[PDB]
């Protein structure tokens, strides 16, 4: 199936188009080229600094009529400087400015942790640690409550957050909309076994993101493991005459996760789509499982003393 079942009651596509590190010259016809080949969600975040190309391109197959706004699934999320009560509806709306939409079908916070507002995106001290914000989870939780009571998005979840701070938005005092995703990464060398389990038993959707491992990330090292290159996975890629994507794309889907493969090349945004036509076997997914590694691709450095650092924590 293309969907699966939010509880918010609405559906959302099981297969979109990542935009981290799609430069803004050429993402536009990237995301021209996914709607025209069949992706009908875009996942999308102000830190990422193209949502105004992004909105270009939605915007004109929207206006060409290529699809309905109701056919399309426009994710973003509030980055960790505007974590604040009195910052988060401006910027969702300036989000929304950018995308050229009235609505997002989910708005995420898009890290756990709060830095301090300004212009910033990561304001360090002089040593290089990040600079907290005083925010908690769960006043931002609110005030991204809020964003869904004034029409402005459909569905609201988190990212990056581990099982317990999932739990303490699911124990908060006064909850009125429970997440509807968590957004994490999710690989072969990341399996996330635990965490996703917890998710799914509480009826929150997980997103896989770096699902082929961010080869283009910037602070790629040679030593690093390199999924694409595990003559592993492309053993059983051949068995299946697919790419070695394509597996890495196929194997969350059938963990029942969202999977948000990003590209700008037209030929593979085109082959990350033509996923819906093989099935891997309980083997090949029980085999691709036994390659984690606890690898990440994102977890900075610098971040790594905030209060609510997700990841120093067993899951
Ligand atoms: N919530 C968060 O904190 C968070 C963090 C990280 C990522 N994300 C989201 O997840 C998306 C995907 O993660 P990612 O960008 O880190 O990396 P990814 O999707 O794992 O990998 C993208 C890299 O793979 C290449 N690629 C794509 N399709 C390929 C194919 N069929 N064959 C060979 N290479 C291929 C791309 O090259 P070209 O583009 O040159 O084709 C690019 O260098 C992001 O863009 C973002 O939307 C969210
Ligand atoms: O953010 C993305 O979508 C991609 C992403 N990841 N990372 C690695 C990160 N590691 C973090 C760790 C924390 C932490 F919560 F753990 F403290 C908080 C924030 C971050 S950013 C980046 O540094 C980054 C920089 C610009 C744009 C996008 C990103």
């Given at each position: 199936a293309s969907r699966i079942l939010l509880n918010n009651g609405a559906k959302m596509p099981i297969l979109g188009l990542g935009?981290?590190?799609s430069p803004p010259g050429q993402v536009t016809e990237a995301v021209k080229v996914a709607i025209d080949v069949g992706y009908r969600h875009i996942d999308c975040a102000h830190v990422y600094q193209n949502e105004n190309e992004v909105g270009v391109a939605i915007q004109?197959?929207?206006r060409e009529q290529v699809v309905k706004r109701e056919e399309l699934f426009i994710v973003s999320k509030l980055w960790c400087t505007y974590h604040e009560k009195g910052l988060v509806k401006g910027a969702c709306q300036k989000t929304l400015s950018d995308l050229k939409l009235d609505y997002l079908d989910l708005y995420l916070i898009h890290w756990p942790t709060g830095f301090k507002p300004g212009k910033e995106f990561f304001p360090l001290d002089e040593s290089g640690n990040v600079?907290?914000?005083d925010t908690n989870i769960l006043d931002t939780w609110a005030a991204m409550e809020?964003?869904?009571?004034?029409?402005?998005v459909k569905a609201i979840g988190i990212?990056?957050?581990?099982h317990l701070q999932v739990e303490m938005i699911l124990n908060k005092p006064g909850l009125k909309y429970k997440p509807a995703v968590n957004?994490?990464?999710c690989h072969p060398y990341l399996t996330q076994e635990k965490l996703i389990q917890y998710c799914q038993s509480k009826g929150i959707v997980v997103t896989a993101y770096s699902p082929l491992g961010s080869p283009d990330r910037p602070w790629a090292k040679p030593e690093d493991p390199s999924?694409?290159?595990?003559?592993?996975?492309?053993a059983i890629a051949a068995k299946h005459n697919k790419t070695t994507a394509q597996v890495l794309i196929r194997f969350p889907m059938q963990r029942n996760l969202v999977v948000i493969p990003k590209s700008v090349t037209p030929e593979r945004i085109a082959?990350?789509?033509?996923?819906?036509?093989?099935?891997?076997?309980?083997?090949?997914?029980?085999?691709?499982?036994?390659?984690?590694?606890?690898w990440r691709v994102c977890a900075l450095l610098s971040c790594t003393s905030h209060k609510d650092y997700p990841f120093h924590e067993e899951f």
């Open positions: 935009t981290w590190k004109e197959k929207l600079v907290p914000s809020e964003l869904v009571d004034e029409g402005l990212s990056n957050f581990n957004q994490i990464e999924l694409l290159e595990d003559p592993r996975i492309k082959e990350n789509f033509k996923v819906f036509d093989f099935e891997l076997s309980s083997q090949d997914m029980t085999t691709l499982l036994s390659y984690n590694r606890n």
